[PDB]
Amino acid sequence: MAKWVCKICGYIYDEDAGDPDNGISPGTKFEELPDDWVCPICGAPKSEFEKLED
């Protein structure tokens, strides 16, 4: 699945891994994350992520 980078800190949201410690099971697409989900490292909102693809 896709990877998304936080433009603030460099954390990678990997859809294959999810974010289970913050309530997100593996295989959750970025677009399916709750509107209130934030970067687990720096707290950046979803707006600050960019998908890693051309």
Author numbering: 0 to 53
Quote the study's own text.
In the current study, perdeuterated Pyrococcus furiosus rubredoxin was produced with the iron atom from the [Fe-4S] cluster replaced by the 113Cd isotope. Here we show that it is possible to use neutron anomalous scattering to phase protein crystal structures in a practical fashion. The present demonstration takes advantage of the neutron anomalous scattering properties of 113Cd, the availability of modern high-intensity monochromatic neutron beamlines such as D19 at the ILL, and protein perdeuteration to determine the structure of a biological macromolecule using de novo phasing in a reasonable timescale.
In the current study the anomalous scatterer was introduced in the metal chelating site using chemical reagents to remove the native iron prior to isomorphous replacement with the 113Cd isotope.
